[PDB]
Amino acid sequence: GHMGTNRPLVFVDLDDTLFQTSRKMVEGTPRTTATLDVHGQPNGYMNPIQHSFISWLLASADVVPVTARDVEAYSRVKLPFTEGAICSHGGVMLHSDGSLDQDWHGQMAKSLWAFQDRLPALSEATLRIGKDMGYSLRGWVVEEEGLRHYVVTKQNESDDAVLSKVLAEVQARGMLEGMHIHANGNNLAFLPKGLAKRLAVQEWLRRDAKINGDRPVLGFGDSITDLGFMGLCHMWATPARSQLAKAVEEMII
Amino acid sequence: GHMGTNRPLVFVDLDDTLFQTSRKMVEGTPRTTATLDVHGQPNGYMNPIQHSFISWLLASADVVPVTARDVEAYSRVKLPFTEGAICSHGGVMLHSDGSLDQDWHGQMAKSLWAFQDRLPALSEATLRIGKDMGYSLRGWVVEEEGLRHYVVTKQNESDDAVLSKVLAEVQARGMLEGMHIHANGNNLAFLPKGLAKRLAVQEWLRRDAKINGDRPVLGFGDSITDLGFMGLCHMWATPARSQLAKAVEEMII
Ligand SMILES: [Mg+2]
Numbered sequence: 001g002h003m004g005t006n007r008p009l010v011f012v013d014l015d016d017t018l019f020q021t022s023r024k025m026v027e028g029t030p031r032t033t034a035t036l037d038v039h040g041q042p043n044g045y046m047n048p049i050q051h052s053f054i055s056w057l058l059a060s061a062d063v064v065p066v067t068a069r070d071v072e073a074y075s076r077v078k079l080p081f082t083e084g085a086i087c088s089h090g091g092v093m094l095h096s097d098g099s100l101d102q103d104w105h106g107q108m109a110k111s112l113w114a115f116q117d118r119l120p121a122l123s124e125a126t127l128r129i130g131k132d133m134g135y136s137l138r139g140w141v142v143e144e145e146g147l148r149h150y151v152v153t154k155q156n157e158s159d160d161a162v163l164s165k166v167l168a169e170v171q172a173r174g175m176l177e178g179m180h181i182h183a184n185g186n187n188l189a190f191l192p193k194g195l196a197k198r199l200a201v202q203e204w205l206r207r208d209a210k211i212n213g214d215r216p217v218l219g220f221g222d223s224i225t226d227l228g229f230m231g232l233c234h235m236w237a238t239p240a241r242s243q244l245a246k247a248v249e250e251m252i253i
Numbered sequence: 254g255h256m257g258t259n260r261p262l263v264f265v266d267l268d269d270t271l272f273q274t275s276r277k278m279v280e281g282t283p284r285t286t287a288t289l290d291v292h293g294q295p296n297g298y299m300n301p302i303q304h305s306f307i308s309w310l311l312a313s314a315d316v317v318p319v320t321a322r323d324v325e326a327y328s329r330v331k332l333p334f335t336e337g338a339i340c341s342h343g344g345v346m347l348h349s350d351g352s353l354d355q356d357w358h359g360q361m362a363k364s365l366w367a368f369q370d371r372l373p374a375l376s377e378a379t380l381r382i383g384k385d386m387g388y389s390l391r392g393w394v395v396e397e398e399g400l401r402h403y404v405v406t407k408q409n410e411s412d413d414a415v416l417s418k419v420l421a422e423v424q425a426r427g428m429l430e431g432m433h434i435h436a437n438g439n440n441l442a443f444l445p446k447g448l449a450k451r452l453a454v455q456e457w458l459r460r461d462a463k464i465n466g467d468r469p470v471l472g473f474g475d476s477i478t479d480l481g482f483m484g485l486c487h488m489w490a491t492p493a494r495s496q497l498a499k500a501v502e503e504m505i506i
């Protein structure tokens with residue numbers, strides 16, 4: 001029979017699904033502010049269709065962000081999400097009021113303690129292996145309170161093909177066993193096995209089913225690696241020009 | 254500025270996206286009737302998630318079916334669509350009250366007159382070429398009012414790989430120039446160039462923009478060939494276990 005709410009539960013990626021930076025839009029086109037930079041100034045935008053879409057979705061369903069952003073960067077997202085969030089590539093769950101989920105934090109600490117020294121070492125080596133190769137990079141360890149989660153690397157060349165080079169080398173040098181990778185645009189991330197959007201979405205659904213039983217689940221994402229959590233949904237969706245959609249277009253023809 | 258409605262326009266495939274036959278569901282599982290056969294008895298069903306999903310979508314957005322079903326077969330779909338429909342693989346547009354769109358019918362007649370004899374000939378040959386390789390098939394020409402639209406072929410072996418064989422031969426014998434194909438499950442269709450869900454959806458959007466300007470457009474489909482019309486949308490979506498989703502899963506790994 002029916003229990004709890006029967007409205008859809010919608011897991012949404014953030015960057016390049018709901019909004020994007022100025023450099024990824026055509027100059028001069030209408031837009032509204034979706035994110036702020038660390039200096040408090042706008043740095044991510046929605047075009048009019050994007051704003052209409054997320055407003056409709058927020059009003060029509062229970063919308064849960066599923067994002068690589070850490071808690072601080074998620075707090076600079078200026079959208080009125082009301083149901084909590086999954087942050088830091090699945091390393092963090094936030095309650096609706098923004099407080100940290102202590103249970104998941106405990107489970108994550110368990111999965112990631114074997115990695116706590118390797119992650120700073122791997123970021124150091126990558127940034128050095130990058131200068132060695134000759135690129136002007138940057139990178140850091142994403143961490144949430146002491147617990148270190150994953151490694152991210154970006155380039156300042158305006159050439160995202162730089163990151164594919166490095167990824168090819170670190171793979172050869174075998175610095176990535178027991179881990180998985182995310183590469184989209186100017187972002188290359190190295191993630192421990194037990195850190196994934198999929199695992200957090202899996203847990204979110206387990207908790208939801210105790211309250212609301214089986215209700216429609218929809219997943220929205222733009223990256224190929226978003227297919228991990230999207231495959232847990234009844235239906236999944238992608239923007240027409242996303243990394244994922246472009247890959248699908250090449251597969252059919 | 255704003256004009257008309259700003260609710261999403263959602264183009265939805267029907268068979269295997271919103272519902273399916275009994276043979277495609279697990280025996281005994283809960284279900285509700287979505288379609289009737291020609292004898293008036295139920296023959297397509299929604300599981301509880303599917304029913305919750307389409308009810309939500311119909312209440313939340315302007316939903317337009319985009320279907321291979323001809324007008325008679327669409328009339329056996331027992332869902333309360335209120336905005337009209339695209340039928341017969343894009344060959345037919347219906348107004349909200351179910352009456353035929355005369356303009357599109359005129360444009361289709363124009364595109365398909367060079368095919369009016371070839372389609373019965375191609376169906377005849379395919380059904381004969383099928384008995385020769387010895388499969389027990391069946392097929393016919395889909396037509397609405399005299400104007401012939403496309404050729405469909407099915408098999409009674411319970412072996413959908415039979416149709417891939419025939420398709421390989423008719424392609425070799427070159428009976429399909431100037432045409433395109435749809436193959437999913439126990440269905441193989443040969444379509445003239447100017448007959449496509451994409452063309453009708455393209456026209457539907459052109460008309461909508463004169464009334465409602467630019468509003469979010471979402472496309473839902475399960476077949477690889479549904480990517481034609483889905484690529485005209487701002488976002489597209491698919492059931493997690495569709496032909497399309499299965500192809501995407503093989504492309505990534
Ligand atoms: Mg993203």
Ligand SMILES: [Mg+2]
Binds near residue numbers: 268476
């Ligand atoms: Mg279908």
